[PDB]
């Protein structure tokens, strides 16, 4: 019998791995390290001429070849381990993996690997590819690390630098869930806009480096987003970093540089108060 359980050690939720490690914490730590060493080397590599699922598979192989026998292989196809057993079987099921990869490949061909596009089209399309990869979940494990590097490389070849380190866990989760369940890509587009705009990335970075907590919660449990030029926000001034105010609105936190606000606007603000901020264009 091919079985999904043949991916794991007997009676365990630990994946079979080239380290022989059954302890889940120890396994996770070692995999994290091996794949982080591979990632740093991949970041420096020349990007490919064409971005497609074969490059995605290459990245997964490079990231996980020291960890998994199946590095570079997709989960829809049975995989035969060296021990003789065969494994099979975050949501596309079966043939849906191949369809998802096909659709991403078609998108990338049609949009010239996202090169030569307007900024708005670059954002709509990289967000859509990230969401499609989410849904496709083509690998047994390591999808997130592989998707991220793929998008980093894609952005690099198009002239942008992506900094995923300014995205909170809560922001990534809510953006991903909303894209998949409500078909709403707006949170994902805003995420990619922030992390590809060096000014917005720096605003978010200074916030993260200054504050462990926002509004009585760990910052990683808060959706924090950069303020956009031209927008008016109304909410509660809940926290203050040296450079920025933090405005709570519709359950999220807008990080607004004090450099973008006028003295008149600044004198107006008191921590805990409701306020209305317009960011100039």
> Closest Cα partner for 247 from 266, 280, 225, 265?
225
H or E, element range at 32: helix 24-44
Angle between helices 143-157 and 53-64 (to 10 degrees): 120
DSSP 66-133: TT-TTTT--TTS-EE-TTS-EE------TTHHHHHHHHHHHHHHHTGGG-S--HHHHHHHHHHHHHHH
Burial class (CB in 10 A: 0-12, 13-18, 19+), 187: buried
Least Cα distance to 190 among 231, 157, 245, 139 occurs for: 231
What CATH fold (topology level) applies to the domain 1-223? Answer: Fic-like fold (1.10.3290)
The encoded tokens of residue 4 equal 């999904």
Q: Which class is 224-281 in CATH?
A: mainly beta
CATH 2.40.50.140 residue spans of the chain: 224-281
Cβ 171 vs Cβ 225: under 8 Å: yes
Resolution (A): 1.9
Sign of CA dihedral 268, 272, 276, 281: positive
Question: Which method was used?
Answer: X-ray
Q: Measuring CA to CA, which residue among 269, 210, 264 is closest to residue 241?
A: 210
Q: How many CB atoms lie within 10 A of CB 23?
A: 11
Give dist(CA 30, CA 27) in Å, integer: 5
DSSP state letter for 16: P
**104 in Cβ contact with 136 (< 8 Å):** yes
Residue ranges of the chain assigned to CATH 1.10.3290.10:
1-223
Q: How many other CB atoms sit within 10 Å of the CB of residue 47?
A: 16
């Amino acid at each position: 019998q091919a079985l999904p359980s043949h991916y794991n050690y007997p009676n365990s939720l630990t994946l079979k791995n080239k380290y022989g490690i059954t302890n889940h914490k120890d396994f996770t730590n070692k995999c994290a390290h091996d794949s982080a060493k591979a990632a740093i080397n991949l970041r420096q590599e020349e990007p490919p001429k064409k971005f497609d699922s074969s490059y995605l598979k290459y990245l997964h192989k490079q990231l996980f070849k020291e960890t998994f026998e199946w590095a570079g292989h997709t989960r829809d196809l049975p995989f035969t381990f060296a021990d003789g057993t065969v494994g099979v079987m975050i949501f596309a099921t079966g043939n849906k993996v191949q369809d998802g990869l096909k659709n991403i490949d078609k998108m990338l061909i049609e949009k010239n690997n996202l090169q030569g596009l307007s900024h708005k089209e670059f954002i709509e399309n990289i967000a859509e590819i990230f969401a499609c990869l989410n849904y496709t979940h083509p690998f047994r494990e390591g999808n997130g690390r592989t998707q991220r590097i793929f998008c980093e490389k894609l952005a690099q070849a198009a002239g942008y630098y992506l900094d995923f380190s300014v995205v909170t866990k809560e922001r990534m989760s809510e953006a991903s869930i909303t894209a998949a369940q409500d078909s709403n890509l707006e949170p994902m587009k805003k995420l990619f806009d922030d992390i590809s705009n060096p000014i917005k990335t720096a605003v978010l970075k200074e916030c993260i480096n200054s504050l462990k907590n926002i509004d009585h919660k760990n910052i990683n449990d808060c959706i924090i987003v950069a303020a956009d030029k031209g927008l008016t926000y109304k909410g509660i001034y809940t926290d203050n970093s040296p450079d920025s105010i933090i405005l709570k609105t519709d359950n999220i936190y807008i990080i607004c540089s004090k450099n973008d606000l006028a003295p008149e606007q600044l004198k107006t603000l008191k921590l805990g108060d409701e306020c209305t901020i317009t960011v100039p264009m």
